[PDB]
Design a protein around this ligand. Structure first.
Ligand SMILES: COC(=O)Nc1ccc2c(c1)NC(=O)CCCC[C@H](NC(=O)/C=C/c1cc(Cl)ccc1-n1cnnn1)c1nc-2c[nH]1
Length: 238
């Protein structure tokens, strides 16, 4: 996260750190708890991930230093990538992790509500991007979870900012015209959380941008409201 500040413990209890174990253990991506055995994240996080056996989901983490060999995690039973996914820049950048065991909800770990299909028209004015990602292009994963408040950008304005790309309504953009605050390397897969009527909603999934926090280059997020039926298809299968 660029231009962000340290989160407080329990502030974003749906935020997870997804680690890979191959060749050595390290943070791979962010993710969000959306159900008691479900993590919503970005499809591009699994580039070159041949098996769910190398994945570890850690919830209730503020500091990466809380994670050692003796730290409990959730194993991943299954990786579900959207069928239409090709690359982050073309959209459908969404995946679900079915966990091997159930998350016990509490003040340190609980789900974030999915946006309502009826609320596709609501204007979100209190949106925050969170993660342990870089503070600038050439940096390192941060110990403490960071947060940055960022305004949503219309599809029309985002399309003007990305000449040569096709910014669809299945993407949602966020950033200041002047730049300064954004997601960066290591934040992808994490949430873009917006508070509306005292309830937090998972509005976006950190996906891509041209550089980090650049002037007139908003961050591009998967527009979660457009995938609510796909999520229910995969999580509520009979
Ligand atoms: C010690 O552990 C370690 O260093 N781990 C570690 C470090 C870095 C990584 C990573 C793991 N994950 C990946 O490479 C897979 C995942 C690969 C893509 C991922 N993309 C982002 O996270 C976000 C991009 C992004 C999103 C928005 Cl909204 C705006 C600007 C963006 N950027 C443009 N340029 N940079 N960012 C990434 N992640 C990493 C490097 N790239």
């Amino acid at each position: 996260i660029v231009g962000g500040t340290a989160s407080v413990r329990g502030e974003w209890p749906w935020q997870v750190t997804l680690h890979t174990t191959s060749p050595t253990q390290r943070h791979l991506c962010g993710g969000s708890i959306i159900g008691n055995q479900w993590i919503l994240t970005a499809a591009h996080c699994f580039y070159g991930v041949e098996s769910p056996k190398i994945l570890r989901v850690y919830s209730g983490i503020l500091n990466q230093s809380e994670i050692k060999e003796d730290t409990s995690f959730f194993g991943v039973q299954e990786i579900i990538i959207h069928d239409q996914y090709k690359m982050a820049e073309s959209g459908y950048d969404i995946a679900l992790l079915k966990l091997e065991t159930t998350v016990g909800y509490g003040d340190s770990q609980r789900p974030i509500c999915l946006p309502s299909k009826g609320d596709r028209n609501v204007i979100y004015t209190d949106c925050w991007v969170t993660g342990w990602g870089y503070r600038k292009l050439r940096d390192k994963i941060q110990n403490t979870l960071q947060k940055a408040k960022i305004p949503l950008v219309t599809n029309e304005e985002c399309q003007k900012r990305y000449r040569g790309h096709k910014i669809t309504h299945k993407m949602i953009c966020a950033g200041y015209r002047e730049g300064g605050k954004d997601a960066c390397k290591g934040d992808s897969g994490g949430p873009l959380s917006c508070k509306h009527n005292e309830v937090w909603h998972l509005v976006g999934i950190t996906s891509w941008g041209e550089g980090c926090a650049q002037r007139e280059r908003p961050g591009v997020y998967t527009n979660v409201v457009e995938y609510v039926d796909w999520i229910l298809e995969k999580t509520q299968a009979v």
